[PDB]
Amino acid sequence: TTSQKHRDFVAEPMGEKPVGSLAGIGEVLGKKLEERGFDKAYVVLGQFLVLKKDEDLFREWLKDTCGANAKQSRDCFGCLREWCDAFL
Amino acid sequence: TTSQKHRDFVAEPMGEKPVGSLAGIGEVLGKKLEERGFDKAYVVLGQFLVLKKDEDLFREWLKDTCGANAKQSRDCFGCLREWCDAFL
Amino acid sequence: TTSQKHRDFVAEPMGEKPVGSLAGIGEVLGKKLEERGFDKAYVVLGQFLVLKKDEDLFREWLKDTCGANAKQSRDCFGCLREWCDAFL
Amino acid sequence: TTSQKHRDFVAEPMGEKPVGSLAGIGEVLGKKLEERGFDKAYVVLGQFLVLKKDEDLFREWLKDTCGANAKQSRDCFGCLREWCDAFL
Amino acid sequence: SSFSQHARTSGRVAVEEVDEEGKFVRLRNKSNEDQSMGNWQIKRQNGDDPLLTYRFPPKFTLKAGQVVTIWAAGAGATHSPPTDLVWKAQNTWGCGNSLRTALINSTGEEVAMRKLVRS
Amino acid sequence: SSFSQHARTSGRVAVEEVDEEGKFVRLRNKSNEDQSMGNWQIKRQNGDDPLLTYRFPPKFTLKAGQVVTIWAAGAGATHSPPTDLVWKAQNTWGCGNSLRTALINSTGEEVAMRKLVRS
Task: Output the 3-class SS for chain D.
Answer: CCCHHHHHHHHCCCCCCEHHHCCCCCHHHHHHHHHHCCCEHHHHHHHHHHCCCCHHHHHHHHHHHCCCCHHHHHHHHHHHHHHHHHHC
Q: Are strands F67-72 and F84-87 parallel, antiparallel or unpaired?
A: parallel
Whether cis (ω within 30° of 0) applies to the bond prior to C13 is no
Minimal Cα–Cα distance from E110 to chain A, Å? 7
Q: Give the start-end residues of each E strand in chain B.
A: none
Residue E20 in contact with residue E93, Cβ under 8 Å? no
Instruction: Verify whether the Cβ–Cβ distance C49 to D52 is below 8 Å.
Output: no
Q: How far apart are CA C65 and CA C69, in angstroms?
A: 11
Nearest to A66 by CA among A40, A28, A39, A23: A28
Angle (CA) A81-A84-A88 rounded to 5° is 165
Q: Are strands F13-18 and F24-29 parallel, antiparallel or unpaired?
A: antiparallel
**Cβ pairs C/D, distance under 8 A:** 38
Residues 6+ apart with CB under 8 A from D6: D23, D24, D75, D78, D79, D82
The shares of helix, strand and coil residues in chain F, as percent rounded to the nearest 5, are: 5, 50, 45
Q: How far apart are CA A64 and CA A47, in angstroms?
A: 14
Q: Is E7 on the interface with A (CB under 8 A)?
A: no
Which residues of chain B have a CB within 8 Å of the CB of A65?
none
Q: Find, in chain B, the residue whose alpha carbon is nearest to that of A49.
A: B46
Q: How far apart are CA E9 and CA E107, in angstroms?
A: 15
Q: How far apart are CA F93 and CA A2, in angstroms?
A: 68
Q: How far apart are CA D21 and CA D6, in angstroms?
A: 9
Residue C9 in contact with residue C78, Cβ under 8 Å? no
What residue type is assigned to position E88 of the chain? K
User: What distances in angstroms separate CA F116 from CA C16, C49, D2, F72, F119, one per listed residue?
Assistant: 20, 28, 18, 18, 10
Minimal Cα–Cα distance from E97 to chain B, Å? 13
Which residues of chain A have a CB within 8 Å of the CB of E8?
13, 87
Q: How far apart are CA E109 and CA E41, in angstroms?
A: 9
**Cβ pairs D/F, distance under 8 A:** 13
Q: How far apart are CA E100 and CA D39, in angstroms?
A: 57
Residue E56 in contact with residue E40, Cβ under 8 Å? yes
Residue B28 in contact with residue B68, Cβ under 8 Å? no
Residues 6+ apart with CB under 8 A from F110: C11, C12, C13, F43, F102, F103, F104
Residue F78 CB neighbour total at 10 angstroms:
8
Q: How far apart are CA B28 and CA B69, in angstroms?
A: 13
Q: Do at least 3 CB pairs under 8 Å connect F with B?
A: no
Residue E101 in contact with residue E93, Cβ under 8 Å? yes
What residue type is assigned to position A83 of the chain? W
Chain C contact probe: residue of F100, F104, F110 with most C CBs at under 10 A: F110
Minimal Cα–Cα distance from F55 to chain D, Å? 25
Which residues of chain F have a CB within 8 Å of the CB of D13?
8
What residue type is assigned to position C85 of the chain? D
Backbone phi and psi for residue C25, each to the nearest 5 degrees, phi listed first: -110, 115
Chain B contact probe: residue of E5, E6, E119 with most B CBs at under 10 A: E6
Q: Within 13 Å and on the Cβ side, how many CA atoms surround E1? A: 10
Which residues of chain C have a CB within 8 Å of the CB of F10?
86-87
List F85's β-bridge partners, or say none.
F70
Minimal Cα–Cα distance from E80 to chain B, Å? 32
Residue C33 in contact with residue C19, Cβ under 8 Å? yes
Instruction: Verify whether the Cβ–Cβ distance D11 to F5 is below 8 Å.
Output: yes
Instruction: Verify whether the Cβ–Cβ distance E118 to F58 is below 8 Å.
Output: yes
Residue B29 in contact with residue B68, Cβ under 8 Å? yes
Encode D54-80: b = buried (16+ Cβ within 10 Å), e = exposed.
eeeebbeebeebbebeeebbebbbbbb
Three-state DSSP class for E115? strand
DSSP state for residue B18 in the 8-state scheme: B
Which residues of chain E have a CB within 8 Å of the CB of B85?
117
Q: Is E7 on the interface with B (CB under 8 A)?
A: yes
Cβ-count burial of F89 within 10 angstroms (0-12 exposed, 13-18 middle, 19+ buried)? Answer: exposed
Instruction: Verify whether the Cβ–Cβ distance A12 to E8 is below 8 Å.
Output: no
Alpha-carbon torsion, ordered E42, E46, E49, E51, to 10 deg = 10
Q: How far apart are CA B18 and CA B33, in angstroms?
A: 10
Residue E95 CB neighbour total at 10 angstroms:
16
Minimal Cα–Cα distance from B66 to chain E, Å? 29
Nearest to D51 by CA among D26, D82, D18, D80: D80
Instruction: Verify whether the Cβ–Cβ distance B50 to A45 is below 8 Å.
Output: no
Q: Is C87 on the interface with F (CB under 8 A)?
A: yes
Q: Is F97 on the interface with D (CB under 8 A)?
A: no
What residue type is assigned to position C76 of the chain? C
Nearest to B41 by CA among B85, B67, B86, B10: B10
Which residues of chain A have a CB within 8 Å of the CB of E10?
86
Encode D24-47: b = buried (16+ Cβ within 10 Å), e = exposed.
bbeeebbebbeeeebbbbbbbbbb
C47 vs D14, D46, D87: nearest CB: D46
Q: Find, in chain C, the residue whose alpha carbon is nearest to that of D53.
A: C43
Backbone phi and psi for residue D37, each to the nearest 5 degrees, phi listed first: 120, -10
Question: E-contacting residues of F 15-44, CB under 8 Å?
Answer: 39
B87 vs E4, E8, E117: nearest CB: E8
User: What distances in angstroms separate CA B60 from CA B10, B76, D85, E68, one per listed residue?
Assistant: 22, 11, 60, 48
User: What distances in angstroms separate CA C86 from CA D87, F9, F76, F78, one per listed residue?
Assistant: 13, 10, 37, 36
Which residues of chain E have a CB within 8 Å of the CB of A14?
none
Q: How far apart are CA A15 and CA A43, in angstroms?
A: 11
What is chain B's alpha carbon radius of gyration, rounded to the nearest angstrom?
Answer: 11
Q: How far apart are CA F19 and CA F40, in angstroms?
A: 20
Cβ-count burial of F114 within 10 angstroms (0-12 exposed, 13-18 middle, 19+ buried)? Answer: buried
Chain centre to alpha carbon of residue C19: 7
List F43's β-bridge partners, or say none.
F53, F102
Q: How far apart are CA C15 and CA E74, in angstroms?
A: 41
Which residues of chain A have a CB within 8 Å of the CB of E110?
12-13
Q: How far apart are CA D6 and CA D3, in angstroms?
A: 5
List E72's β-bridge partners, or say none.
E87
Q: How far apart are CA B22 and CA B24, in angstroms?
A: 6
Minimal Cα–Cα distance from C39 to chain F, Å? 26
Sheet with strand E110-117: strands edge to edge:
E4-9, E110-117, E98-104, E41-46, E52-55
Q: Is E118 on the interface with F (CB under 8 A)?
A: yes
Alpha-carbon torsion, ordered A9, A13, A17, A19, to 10 deg = 60
Q: Within 13 Å and on the Cβ side, how many CA atoms surround F96? A: 16
Sheet with strand F41-46: strands edge to edge:
F3-9, F110-118, F98-104, F41-46, F52-55
Q: Are strands E67-72 and E61-62 parallel, antiparallel or unpaired?
A: unpaired
Q: Is D67 on the interface with F (CB under 8 A)?
A: no
Helix A27-36 to helix A55-66 angle, to the nearest 10 degrees?
90
Residues 6+ apart with CB under 8 A from F13: F27, F28, F29, F30, F31, F35, F37, F62, F103, F111, F112
Nearest to E73 by CA among E95, E50, E46, E93: E93
DSSP state for residue F80 in the 8-state scheme: B
Which residues of chain A have a CB within 8 Å of the CB of B47?
50
Residue E98 in contact with residue E46, Cβ under 8 Å? yes
* DSSP string computed for E10-70: -SS-EEEEE-TTSSEEEEE--SSS-EE-TT-EEEEEETTSPPEEEE--SS-EEPTT-EEEE
Which residues of chain B have a CB within 8 Å of the CB of E8?
13, 87
Q: How far apart are CA A54 and CA A71, in angstroms?
A: 16
Q: How far apart are CA E40 and CA E24, in angstroms?
A: 16
Technique used to solve these coordinates: cryo-EM
What residue type is assigned to position A59 of the chain? R
Nearest to F96 by CA among F47, F24, F44: F47
Q: Is A50 on the interface with E (CB under 8 A)?
A: no
Residues 6+ apart with CB under 8 A from A40: A16, A17, A18, A19
